[PDB]
Coordinates of C-alpha atoms in Angstrom, one line a residue:
Chain I
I1 CA 35.7 -13.3 1.8
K2 CA 37.0 -12.5 5.2
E3 CA 35.5 -10.3 7.4
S4 CA 38.0 -7.8 7.1
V5 CA 36.6 -6.5 3.9
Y6 CA 32.9 -6.5 5.4
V7 CA 34.2 -4.1 8.1
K8 CA 36.3 -2.1 6.1
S9 CA 33.4 -1.6 3.1
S10 CA 31.0 -0.5 6.3
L11 CA 33.1 0.9 7.8
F12 CA 34.1 3.4 4.1
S13 CA 30.4 3.5 3.5
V14 CA 29.1 5.0 6.8
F15 CA 32.0 7.4 7.2
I16 CA 31.9 9.2 3.7
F17 CA 28.4 11.2 4.8
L18 CA 30.1 11.6 8.5
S19 CA 32.6 13.3 6.8
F20 CA 29.5 15.0 4.9
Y21 CA 28.0 15.4 8.0
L22 CA 31.5 17.0 9.7
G23 CA 32.0 19.3 7.0
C24 CA 28.7 20.4 7.3
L25 CA 29.3 21.1 10.9
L26 CA 32.0 23.1 9.3
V27 CA 30.5 25.1 7.4
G28 CA 28.0 26.2 10.0
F29 CA 30.6 27.0 12.5
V30 CA 32.4 29.7 10.6
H31 CA 28.7 30.8 9.5
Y32 CA 28.4 30.8 13.1
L33 CA 31.3 33.4 13.3
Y34 CA 1.5 22.1 8.6
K35 CA 1.7 19.0 11.0
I36 CA -1.5 17.4 9.3
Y37 CA 1.2 16.5 6.3
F38 CA 3.4 15.3 8.6
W39 CA 0.9 12.9 10.1
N40 CA -0.6 11.5 7.6
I41 CA 2.8 10.8 5.3
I42 CA 4.1 8.8 8.7
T43 CA 1.0 7.1 8.8
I44 CA 0.8 6.2 4.9
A45 CA 4.5 5.1 4.7
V46 CA 4.7 2.9 8.0
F47 CA 1.7 1.3 6.9
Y48 CA 2.2 0.9 3.2
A49 CA 6.0 -1.0 4.5
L50 CA 4.9 -3.2 7.0
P51 CA 3.0 -6.0 5.2
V52 CA 5.3 -5.5 2.1
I53 CA 8.1 -6.0 4.1
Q54 CA 6.6 -9.3 5.4
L55 CA 6.6 -10.2 2.3
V56 CA 10.1 -10.3 1.2
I57 CA 10.7 -11.6 4.3
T58 CA 8.2 -14.5 4.0
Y59 CA 10.0 -15.1 0.4
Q60 CA 13.5 -15.1 1.8
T61 CA 12.9 -17.8 4.1
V62 CA 11.2 -20.1 1.4
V63 CA 14.1 -19.5 -0.9
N64 CA 16.5 -20.1 2.5
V65 CA 14.5 -23.3 3.2
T66 CA 13.6 -24.7 0.2
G67 CA 17.4 -23.4 -1.5
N68 CA 15.7 -22.8 -5.0
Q69 CA 18.3 -19.9 -5.9
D70 CA 16.3 -18.9 -9.0
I71 CA 13.0 -17.0 -7.1
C72 CA 15.4 -14.1 -6.3
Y73 CA 17.3 -11.9 -9.2
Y74 CA 20.8 -11.0 -7.4
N75 CA 23.8 -10.5 -8.5
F76 CA 25.2 -13.9 -7.6
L77 CA 29.2 -12.9 -8.5
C78 CA 28.8 -10.1 -6.0
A79 CA 25.6 -10.9 -3.8
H80 CA 27.4 -11.7 -0.3
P81 CA 25.4 -13.4 3.3
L82 CA 25.7 -12.0 6.7
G83 CA 23.2 -13.7 8.9
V84 CA 19.9 -15.2 6.8
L85 CA 19.9 -11.9 4.7
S86 CA 21.9 -13.8 1.5
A87 CA 22.9 -10.2 -0.6
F88 CA 24.1 -7.9 2.0
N89 CA 25.9 -5.6 0.2
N90 CA 22.6 -4.5 -2.0
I91 CA 21.5 -3.6 1.5
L92 CA 24.0 -1.7 3.1
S93 CA 24.7 -0.2 -0.1
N94 CA 21.3 2.1 0.9
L95 CA 22.8 3.3 3.8
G96 CA 23.6 6.7 2.0
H97 CA 20.2 7.7 1.2
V98 CA 18.7 7.3 4.8
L99 CA 21.4 9.5 5.7
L100 CA 21.2 12.0 3.1
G101 CA 18.2 12.3 3.5
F102 CA 18.9 12.7 7.3
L103 CA 20.8 15.5 6.3
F104 CA 18.7 17.4 4.0
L105 CA 15.6 17.2 6.6
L106 CA 17.9 18.2 9.4
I107 CA 19.2 21.8 7.4
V108 CA 15.5 22.1 6.0
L109 CA 14.8 22.4 9.5
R110 CA 17.8 25.1 10.4
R111 CA 16.8 26.8 7.7
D112 CA 12.9 26.8 9.1
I113 CA 14.4 27.7 12.6
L114 CA 16.2 30.7 11.4
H115 CA 13.2 32.2 9.3
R116 CA 10.8 32.1 12.2
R117 CA 13.7 34.1 14.3
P118 CA 6.1 32.8 -0.7
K119 CA 9.4 30.9 1.0
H120 CA 7.5 28.0 2.2
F121 CA 9.7 24.2 2.9
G122 CA 6.6 22.0 3.7
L123 CA 6.7 20.5 -0.1
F124 CA 10.2 20.2 1.1
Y125 CA 9.8 18.1 4.5
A126 CA 7.2 16.4 2.2
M127 CA 9.8 15.4 -0.3
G128 CA 12.4 14.5 2.2
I129 CA 10.0 11.6 3.8
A130 CA 9.6 10.9 0.2
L131 CA 13.1 10.4 0.0
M132 CA 13.0 8.5 3.1
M133 CA 10.7 5.8 2.0
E134 CA 11.7 5.5 -1.7
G135 CA 15.2 4.1 -0.5
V136 CA 14.4 2.3 2.2
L137 CA 11.6 0.5 0.2
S138 CA 14.8 0.0 -2.8
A139 CA 16.2 -1.9 -0.1
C140 CA 13.4 -4.0 0.9
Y141 CA 12.5 -4.8 -2.7
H142 CA 16.4 -5.6 -3.1
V143 CA 16.4 -7.9 -0.1
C144 CA 14.6 -10.3 -2.6
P145 CA 14.4 -8.7 -6.2
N146 CA 11.3 -10.0 -8.3
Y147 CA 7.9 -8.9 -11.0
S148 CA 6.1 -8.9 -8.0
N149 CA 7.5 -6.5 -5.3
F150 CA 9.2 -4.1 -8.3
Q151 CA 5.2 -3.1 -8.4
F152 CA 5.5 -1.9 -4.8
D153 CA 8.4 -0.3 -5.5
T154 CA 7.1 1.8 -8.3
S155 CA 4.3 2.2 -5.7
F156 CA 5.5 4.9 -3.6
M157 CA 6.3 7.6 -6.4
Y158 CA 3.3 6.4 -8.1
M159 CA 1.5 7.7 -4.7
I160 CA 3.4 10.6 -4.4
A161 CA 2.7 11.8 -8.3
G162 CA -1.2 11.2 -6.6
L163 CA -1.0 13.2 -4.1
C164 CA 1.4 15.8 -5.4
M165 CA -1.7 17.2 -8.3
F166 CA -1.1 0.6 -27.4
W167 CA 2.4 2.1 -27.7
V168 CA 0.8 4.9 -30.5
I169 CA -1.8 5.5 -27.3
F170 CA 1.6 6.1 -24.7
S171 CA 3.3 8.1 -27.4
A172 CA 0.6 10.5 -27.7
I173 CA -0.5 10.7 -24.1
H174 CA 3.3 11.4 -23.1
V175 CA 3.0 14.5 -25.6
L176 CA 0.1 15.6 -25.0
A177 CA 1.4 15.6 -20.8
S178 CA 4.9 17.2 -21.9
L179 CA 3.1 20.1 -23.9
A180 CA 0.0 21.0 -21.4
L181 CA 3.0 20.6 -18.2
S182 CA 4.8 24.1 -20.4
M183 CA 10.2 37.0 -29.3
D184 CA 12.0 33.9 -27.2
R185 CA 9.4 32.2 -25.6
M186 CA 7.6 30.2 -28.7
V187 CA 11.8 29.2 -29.7
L188 CA 13.0 27.9 -26.2
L189 CA 8.6 26.2 -26.0
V190 CA 9.0 24.8 -29.2
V191 CA 12.1 23.3 -28.3
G192 CA 11.4 21.8 -25.3
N193 CA 8.4 20.1 -27.2
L194 CA 10.3 19.3 -30.2
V195 CA 12.9 17.2 -27.3
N196 CA 10.3 15.8 -26.1
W197 CA 9.1 14.3 -29.1
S198 CA 11.9 12.8 -29.5
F199 CA 11.7 10.9 -26.2
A200 CA 8.4 10.2 -27.4
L201 CA 9.8 8.4 -30.5
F202 CA 12.3 6.9 -29.0
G203 CA 9.7 5.3 -26.2
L204 CA 7.5 4.1 -29.7
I205 CA 10.1 2.5 -31.4
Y206 CA 12.7 1.0 -29.1
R207 CA 9.4 -0.6 -27.1
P208 CA 11.5 -1.2 -24.0
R209 CA 10.6 -3.8 -21.2
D210 CA 10.6 -2.0 -18.5
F211 CA 8.3 2.1 -18.1
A212 CA 9.8 3.3 -14.8
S213 CA 13.5 3.3 -17.1
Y214 CA 11.5 5.8 -19.8
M215 CA 8.9 7.3 -16.2
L216 CA 12.9 8.5 -14.7
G217 CA 14.3 9.1 -18.1
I218 CA 11.8 11.9 -18.9
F219 CA 11.8 13.3 -14.8
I220 CA 15.4 14.0 -14.8
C221 CA 15.5 15.2 -18.4
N222 CA 12.1 17.9 -17.6
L223 CA 13.6 18.8 -14.5
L224 CA 17.1 19.6 -15.6
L225 CA 16.1 21.6 -18.8
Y226 CA 13.4 23.2 -15.4
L227 CA 17.1 23.5 -13.8
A228 CA 19.0 25.3 -17.0
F229 CA 15.9 27.6 -17.6
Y230 CA 16.3 28.6 -14.2
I231 CA 20.3 29.4 -14.3
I232 CA 19.4 31.2 -17.8
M233 CA 17.3 33.5 -16.3
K234 CA 18.7 34.2 -13.7
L235 CA 21.9 34.8 -15.9
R236 CA 19.3 37.4 -17.6
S237 CA 18.0 38.9 -14.8
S238 CA 22.0 40.1 -13.8
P239 CA 25.6 28.6 -3.5
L240 CA 27.1 27.8 -7.4
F241 CA 29.5 24.9 -6.6
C242 CA 26.4 23.2 -6.3
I243 CA 25.0 23.3 -9.9
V244 CA 28.7 22.4 -10.7
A245 CA 28.4 19.1 -8.8
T246 CA 24.7 18.3 -10.2
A247 CA 26.3 17.9 -13.5
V248 CA 28.8 15.6 -13.0
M249 CA 27.3 13.2 -10.5
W250 CA 24.5 13.0 -12.6
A251 CA 26.6 11.9 -15.4
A252 CA 28.2 8.9 -13.3
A253 CA 24.3 8.4 -11.9
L254 CA 23.0 7.5 -15.5
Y255 CA 26.5 5.7 -16.7
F256 CA 26.6 3.5 -13.8
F257 CA 22.9 3.5 -14.3
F258 CA 22.8 1.7 -18.4
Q259 CA 24.6 -0.9 -17.2
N260 CA 21.4 -3.2 -16.3
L261 CA 23.3 -5.8 -14.8
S262 CA 20.0 -8.2 -13.9
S263 CA 17.2 -8.0 -15.9
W264 CA 14.0 -9.5 -14.2
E265 CA 11.6 -9.6 -17.1
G266 CA 13.2 -12.6 -18.8
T267 CA 13.2 -16.1 -17.3
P268 CA 16.0 -16.1 -14.4
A269 CA 19.3 -17.6 -16.6
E270 CA 18.9 -15.2 -18.9
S271 CA 19.3 -12.9 -15.9
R272 CA 22.1 -14.1 -15.0
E273 CA 24.1 -13.5 -17.9
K274 CA 24.5 -10.2 -17.5
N275 CA 26.1 -10.6 -13.8
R276 CA 29.4 -8.4 -13.4
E277 CA 32.2 -9.2 -10.2
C278 CA 32.2 -6.8 -7.4
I279 CA 34.7 -3.7 -9.0
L280 CA 34.2 -1.4 -5.6
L281 CA 36.4 -2.3 -2.7
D282 CA 35.8 -6.5 -4.0
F283 CA 32.7 -5.4 -2.2
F284 CA 30.1 -3.5 -4.4
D285 CA 28.8 -4.1 -7.6
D286 CA 27.4 -1.4 -10.3
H287 CA 24.0 -0.8 -9.3
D288 CA 25.1 -0.3 -5.9
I289 CA 27.3 2.6 -7.3
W290 CA 24.3 3.6 -8.9
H291 CA 22.8 3.8 -5.6
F292 CA 25.2 6.4 -4.8
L293 CA 25.8 8.6 -7.1
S294 CA 21.7 8.7 -7.7
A295 CA 21.8 9.9 -4.1
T296 CA 24.5 12.2 -4.2
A297 CA 23.7 13.9 -7.3
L298 CA 19.7 13.6 -6.0
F299 CA 20.2 15.8 -2.7
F300 CA 22.2 18.3 -5.3
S301 CA 20.0 19.3 -7.8
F302 CA 17.6 19.6 -4.3
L303 CA 20.0 21.2 -3.1
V304 CA 19.8 23.7 -6.0
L305 CA 16.0 24.2 -5.3
Chain P
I1 CA -20.9 -30.1 -11.6
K2 CA -22.1 -29.4 -15.0
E3 CA -22.2 -24.9 -15.6
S4 CA -26.0 -25.0 -14.6
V5 CA -25.2 -25.2 -10.9
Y6 CA -22.9 -22.1 -11.9
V7 CA -25.3 -20.5 -13.5
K8 CA -28.1 -20.9 -11.5
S9 CA -26.2 -19.5 -8.3
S10 CA -25.0 -16.8 -9.7
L11 CA -28.5 -16.1 -10.8
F12 CA -30.0 -16.2 -7.3
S13 CA -27.1 -14.3 -5.9
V14 CA -26.8 -11.3 -8.7
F15 CA -31.1 -11.4 -8.3
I16 CA -31.8 -11.5 -4.6
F17 CA -29.3 -8.3 -4.2
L18 CA -31.2 -6.6 -7.5
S19 CA -34.7 -7.5 -5.1
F20 CA -32.9 -5.3 -2.7
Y21 CA -32.6 -2.5 -5.1
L22 CA -36.0 -3.3 -6.3
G23 CA -37.8 -3.2 -2.9
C24 CA -35.6 -0.4 -2.6
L25 CA -37.4 1.0 -5.3
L26 CA -40.5 0.3 -4.1
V27 CA -40.4 2.5 -1.0
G28 CA -38.5 5.5 -3.1
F29 CA -41.7 5.4 -4.9
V30 CA -44.4 4.9 -2.4
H31 CA -42.3 8.0 -0.6
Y32 CA -42.7 10.0 -4.1
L33 CA -46.8 9.8 -3.4
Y34 CA -15.8 17.3 0.6
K35 CA -14.0 15.9 -2.5
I36 CA -10.7 16.7 -1.8
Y37 CA -11.4 13.6 1.0
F38 CA -13.3 12.3 -2.2
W39 CA -10.0 11.9 -4.5
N40 CA -7.7 11.4 -2.2
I41 CA -9.2 8.5 -0.8
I42 CA -9.6 6.9 -4.3
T43 CA -6.5 7.9 -5.6
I44 CA -4.9 6.0 -2.3
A45 CA -7.2 2.6 -3.1
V46 CA -6.2 2.3 -6.7
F47 CA -2.6 2.4 -6.2
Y48 CA -2.9 0.6 -3.1
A49 CA -4.4 -2.1 -4.3
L50 CA -2.6 -2.0 -7.7
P51 CA 0.3 -4.0 -7.0
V52 CA -1.8 -5.5 -4.6
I53 CA -3.8 -7.9 -7.9
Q54 CA -0.5 -7.9 -9.7
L55 CA 1.4 -9.8 -6.8
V56 CA -1.6 -12.7 -6.4
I57 CA -2.6 -12.8 -10.3
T58 CA 1.6 -13.4 -10.3
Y59 CA 0.3 -16.7 -7.7
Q60 CA -2.2 -17.9 -9.4
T61 CA 0.1 -18.0 -12.7
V62 CA 2.6 -19.8 -10.6
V63 CA 0.7 -22.2 -9.1
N64 CA -1.1 -23.2 -12.4
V65 CA 2.1 -22.9 -14.3
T66 CA 4.1 -25.4 -11.9
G67 CA 1.0 -27.4 -10.4
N68 CA 2.7 -27.4 -7.0
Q69 CA -1.3 -27.0 -5.1
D70 CA -0.1 -26.3 -1.3
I71 CA 1.1 -22.5 -2.0
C72 CA -2.4 -21.1 -2.1
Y73 CA -4.8 -22.4 0.9
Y74 CA -8.0 -23.0 -0.6
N75 CA -10.8 -24.7 0.6
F76 CA -10.1 -27.9 -1.8
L77 CA -14.2 -29.6 -1.0
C78 CA -15.7 -26.7 -2.4
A79 CA -13.6 -24.6 -5.3
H80 CA -14.9 -24.6 -8.5
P81 CA -12.8 -23.3 -11.4
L82 CA -13.6 -21.1 -14.0
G83 CA -10.8 -20.0 -16.7
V84 CA -7.7 -19.0 -14.3
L85 CA -9.0 -18.6 -11.6
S86 CA -9.4 -22.2 -9.6
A87 CA -11.8 -21.2 -6.5
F88 CA -14.8 -19.3 -8.2
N89 CA -17.2 -19.4 -5.5
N90 CA -15.1 -17.2 -3.2
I91 CA -14.7 -14.4 -5.8
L92 CA -18.6 -14.1 -7.2
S93 CA -19.7 -14.6 -3.1
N94 CA -17.9 -11.1 -1.9
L95 CA -20.6 -9.3 -4.8
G96 CA -22.7 -9.3 -2.2
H97 CA -20.2 -6.5 -0.3
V98 CA -19.7 -4.0 -3.5
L99 CA -23.4 -4.3 -4.5
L100 CA -24.8 -3.9 -0.5
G101 CA -21.7 -1.1 -0.4
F102 CA -23.7 0.7 -3.4
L103 CA -26.5 0.1 -2.2
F104 CA -25.7 3.0 0.4
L105 CA -23.6 5.2 -1.5
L106 CA -26.3 5.8 -3.2
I107 CA -29.1 6.1 -0.3
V108 CA -26.4 8.7 1.1
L109 CA -26.7 10.7 -2.4
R110 CA -29.9 11.2 -2.7
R111 CA -30.2 11.9 1.3
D112 CA -28.0 14.9 0.9
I113 CA -29.9 15.4 -2.1
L114 CA -32.7 16.1 -0.1
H115 CA -30.8 18.0 2.3
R116 CA -29.4 20.5 -0.2
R117 CA -33.0 21.0 -1.3
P118 CA -24.1 18.4 12.4
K119 CA -26.1 16.1 10.2
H120 CA -22.2 15.3 8.2
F121 CA -22.9 12.3 5.3
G122 CA -19.1 13.1 4.2
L123 CA -18.0 10.3 7.5
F124 CA -20.7 8.2 5.8
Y125 CA -19.3 8.3 2.4
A126 CA -15.8 7.8 3.6
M127 CA -17.0 4.7 5.5
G128 CA -19.1 3.2 1.8
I129 CA -15.7 3.6 -0.1
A130 CA -14.0 1.3 2.7
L131 CA -16.9 -1.6 2.3
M132 CA -15.8 -1.2 -1.6
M133 CA -12.5 -1.4 -1.4
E134 CA -12.6 -4.3 2.1
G135 CA -15.3 -6.4 -0.4
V136 CA -12.7 -6.3 -3.4
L137 CA -9.4 -6.6 -1.7
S138 CA -10.9 -9.8 0.4
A139 CA -11.9 -10.8 -3.0
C140 CA -8.1 -10.5 -4.4
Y141 CA -6.7 -12.2 -1.3
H142 CA -9.5 -15.0 -1.9
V143 CA -8.2 -15.4 -5.0
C144 CA -4.9 -17.2 -3.3
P145 CA -5.1 -16.9 0.2
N146 CA -1.6 -17.4 1.5
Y147 CA 0.1 -15.2 5.2
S148 CA 1.9 -13.0 2.7
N149 CA -1.3 -11.4 1.2
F150 CA -3.5 -11.6 5.1
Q151 CA -1.5 -8.5 5.9
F152 CA -2.5 -7.0 2.6
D153 CA -5.6 -7.5 4.0
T154 CA -5.5 -6.2 7.1
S155 CA -3.9 -3.2 5.5
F156 CA -6.9 -1.4 4.6
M157 CA -8.2 -1.9 8.1
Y158 CA -5.4 -0.3 9.3
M159 CA -4.8 2.8 7.5
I160 CA -8.5 3.8 8.2
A161 CA -7.8 3.1 11.8
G162 CA -4.7 5.3 11.2
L163 CA -7.1 8.4 9.1
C164 CA -9.9 8.2 11.2
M165 CA -8.0 9.3 14.5
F166 CA 3.9 -10.1 25.1
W167 CA 0.6 -10.9 25.5
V168 CA 0.0 -9.7 29.1
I169 CA 1.4 -6.3 26.9
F170 CA -0.8 -6.4 24.8
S171 CA -3.7 -7.0 27.0
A172 CA -2.5 -3.8 29.3
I173 CA -2.7 -2.0 26.1
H174 CA -5.9 -3.0 25.3
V175 CA -7.9 -2.2 28.7
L176 CA -5.9 1.0 28.1
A177 CA -7.5 1.6 25.0
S178 CA -11.1 0.7 25.9
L179 CA -11.1 2.9 29.0
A180 CA -9.8 5.9 27.3
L181 CA -12.1 5.1 24.5
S182 CA -15.1 5.7 27.0
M183 CA -25.4 8.4 39.6
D184 CA -25.5 5.6 37.1
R185 CA -23.0 6.7 34.6
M186 CA -21.0 5.0 36.9
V187 CA -22.7 1.5 37.2
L188 CA -22.4 1.7 33.0
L189 CA -18.8 2.5 32.4
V190 CA -17.9 -0.1 35.4
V191 CA -19.5 -2.9 33.6
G192 CA -18.7 -2.0 30.0
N193 CA -14.7 -1.7 31.6
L194 CA -15.5 -5.3 33.0
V195 CA -16.6 -6.8 29.7
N196 CA -14.0 -5.6 27.8
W197 CA -11.7 -6.6 31.0
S198 CA -13.1 -10.0 30.1
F199 CA -12.3 -10.3 26.5
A200 CA -9.0 -8.6 27.3
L201 CA -7.8 -11.9 29.7
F202 CA -9.6 -14.3 27.6
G203 CA -6.9 -12.4 24.7
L204 CA -4.2 -13.2 27.7
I205 CA -4.9 -16.9 28.5
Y206 CA -6.2 -18.5 25.1
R207 CA -3.3 -16.2 23.6
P208 CA -5.3 -16.9 19.5
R209 CA -3.4 -17.5 16.0
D210 CA -5.2 -14.7 14.3
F211 CA -4.9 -11.3 15.9
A212 CA -7.5 -10.0 13.1
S213 CA -9.9 -12.3 14.6
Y214 CA -9.3 -10.7 18.2
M215 CA -9.1 -7.3 16.6
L216 CA -12.2 -7.6 14.3
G217 CA -14.5 -9.2 17.4
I218 CA -13.5 -6.4 19.9
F219 CA -14.7 -4.0 17.1
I220 CA -18.1 -6.2 16.5
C221 CA -18.5 -6.0 20.8
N222 CA -18.0 -2.7 21.0
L223 CA -19.8 -1.1 18.3
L224 CA -23.1 -3.4 19.6
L225 CA -22.4 -1.7 22.9
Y226 CA -22.5 1.4 21.9
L227 CA -25.6 0.9 19.7
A228 CA -28.2 -1.0 22.1
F229 CA -26.5 2.2 24.2
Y230 CA -28.3 5.1 21.8
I231 CA -31.4 2.5 21.5
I232 CA -31.7 2.6 25.4
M233 CA -30.9 6.4 25.9
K234 CA -33.2 7.2 23.4
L235 CA -35.9 4.8 24.8
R236 CA -35.2 7.1 27.9
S237 CA -35.7 10.6 26.1
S238 CA -39.3 8.9 25.0
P239 CA -36.9 2.5 11.7
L240 CA -37.3 -0.2 14.2
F241 CA -36.8 -3.2 11.6
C242 CA -33.3 -2.8 10.8
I243 CA -32.9 -2.3 14.4
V244 CA -34.9 -6.5 14.5
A245 CA -32.7 -7.5 11.5
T246 CA -29.1 -6.6 12.8
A247 CA -29.3 -8.8 15.4
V248 CA -30.3 -11.5 13.7
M249 CA -28.1 -11.2 10.7
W250 CA -24.9 -10.6 13.1
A251 CA -25.5 -14.1 15.0
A252 CA -25.9 -15.8 12.3
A253 CA -22.7 -14.4 10.4
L254 CA -20.7 -14.9 14.1
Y255 CA -22.4 -18.5 13.2
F256 CA -20.6 -19.1 10.3
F257 CA -17.6 -17.2 10.9
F258 CA -16.5 -19.1 14.2
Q259 CA -16.3 -22.4 11.7
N260 CA -12.7 -21.8 10.1
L261 CA -12.7 -23.6 7.6
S262 CA -9.3 -23.1 6.2
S263 CA -6.1 -22.2 8.6
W264 CA -2.8 -21.1 7.1
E265 CA -1.4 -20.7 9.9
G266 CA -0.6 -24.4 9.7
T267 CA 1.0 -26.3 7.7
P268 CA -1.2 -27.1 4.4
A269 CA -2.3 -30.8 5.2
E270 CA -3.5 -29.2 8.6
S271 CA -5.1 -25.9 7.0
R272 CA -6.9 -29.1 4.6
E273 CA -8.1 -30.7 7.9
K274 CA -11.2 -28.5 8.2
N275 CA -11.8 -28.9 4.8
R276 CA -15.6 -28.8 4.6
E277 CA -17.9 -29.9 1.5
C278 CA -20.5 -27.3 0.1
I279 CA -23.4 -26.8 1.4
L280 CA -25.6 -24.2 -0.2
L281 CA -26.8 -25.0 -3.8
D282 CA -23.9 -27.4 -4.3
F283 CA -22.0 -23.7 -5.0
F284 CA -21.6 -22.3 -1.2
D285 CA -19.1 -22.7 1.5
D286 CA -19.4 -21.3 5.6
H287 CA -16.8 -18.9 4.8
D288 CA -18.7 -17.3 2.0
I289 CA -22.3 -17.4 3.4
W290 CA -20.3 -15.5 6.2
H291 CA -19.0 -13.1 3.2
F292 CA -23.2 -12.7 2.7
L293 CA -24.7 -11.9 6.3
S294 CA -21.5 -9.9 7.3
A295 CA -22.5 -8.0 4.4
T296 CA -25.7 -7.6 5.2
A297 CA -25.2 -7.0 9.3
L298 CA -22.8 -4.4 7.7
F299 CA -25.1 -2.9 6.0
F300 CA -28.1 -3.0 8.7
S301 CA -25.7 -1.5 11.3
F302 CA -24.7 1.7 9.6
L303 CA -28.7 1.6 8.2
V304 CA -29.5 2.7 12.0
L305 CA -26.2 5.1 12.0

């Protein structure tokens, strides 16, 4: 494909979130008419990031010089090269993560500024920086996806889970964590325990090869349950468009997520069995669309928060 | 070589460090006649380590299966296999690091306990955990040394330097840092600035290919200068065997360090040009001896502290 589609796709990808900032600017104009944590998080992020970038760039160089293309588990039907990067679409598509995180950080910043002129935003700042780092490190992982660097991809989320605080054993421990985390209170508590136990038994029986998949699945299910709890309790106590947008963006996100176009758990030939052609602007594939809706649904859900 | 030399060498190492503990026990019997930082440090250490061992074990598995031995930069004359590890001597030799570190933690612990029954030990505990992690991660790096994981090797020391707070530009910035860190005060300050400047122009002219070596050298020289300052200033104000031992072990450690038997920055054949035969018990090489004396000189140096 010619560079014309390159520039069209890139311009569209940037300009959609540029229009998001533009609309936010109209909203603001219509309305017109704790550094220790920040320093620690920036140091930890930059220092942990540096050598994994070195590692992935070394992998890219060695695969480019050797020509042995089964080292990286790309989407070889929707792979577009530019310079030394042999898969640019998956790199550019993660721009939405960073831009949406920036918009989030700035709205939180102006909220704090207006507050100065238990409503705390420090955890919000930390989680926004977490979104920053997760997006960027996901991009670096997508430079060349392998078994080795997937652990580094989930290492930041493991870090965050640490700071914030065989399958039968896993199911039992998951059940224990679910019950420990959380006239009518007993009924809803039992309902939550039951829905958690259902995913526990799916994890026990199905036995997937991707642990992070179920980790994120229980994550999204638990936070959506808590959001439904918050909305129903607010209703019983006697803006709104974000609540509606959350559900549709997340529904699209899960649809695009459960495609599993690339699977590095097997041999690379088997991972090339599930490749699918480009579907968006002849430049993007299902995984990049998953990136986009994951970013926007994440933003909307935390906007409810 | 037979397993006999394996067991003799391993038993020798473990028993000499056990003799260190035993002598400490005689000393103690003769004398007889802040959790947030700990939790954070252990969490970050474990979580950052985990994918590093995952990556290096993946490297070991792939080199073992494909048989392409130029992936890892070993000491192929002093390489001894055991199980899946193809270089056991470099792994076992780092046992002294963790064992001496454990000694340091226990003596600090008894000192604190006696204190309960501005003398602060929190930084001492943090640096002891640092010793532990540096030793273990150096072992994991020595499983299969390459360009990629050397950055992870220096990553922990970069981490610590962050928490505790083109060559001409580097020399100028080094000079600025040296002068910013630190009748007769002027003369000694000028002397320190002069030796720092001499090392700065040494790095500027020689332009070494190992930045970590340069940083470690300036670290050793600076703390040696500060220790000599402490001794001379205590002398002017009107035990000692540790002070005596520090110099001898550190000089021998530098002697063994400047051998540079393996150099991954070139092609693997050039790194194999500088291989040297086993020298100690027909089981160890110069780098492992550097491991040992680095550990003991480290322990003695902060024993003075």
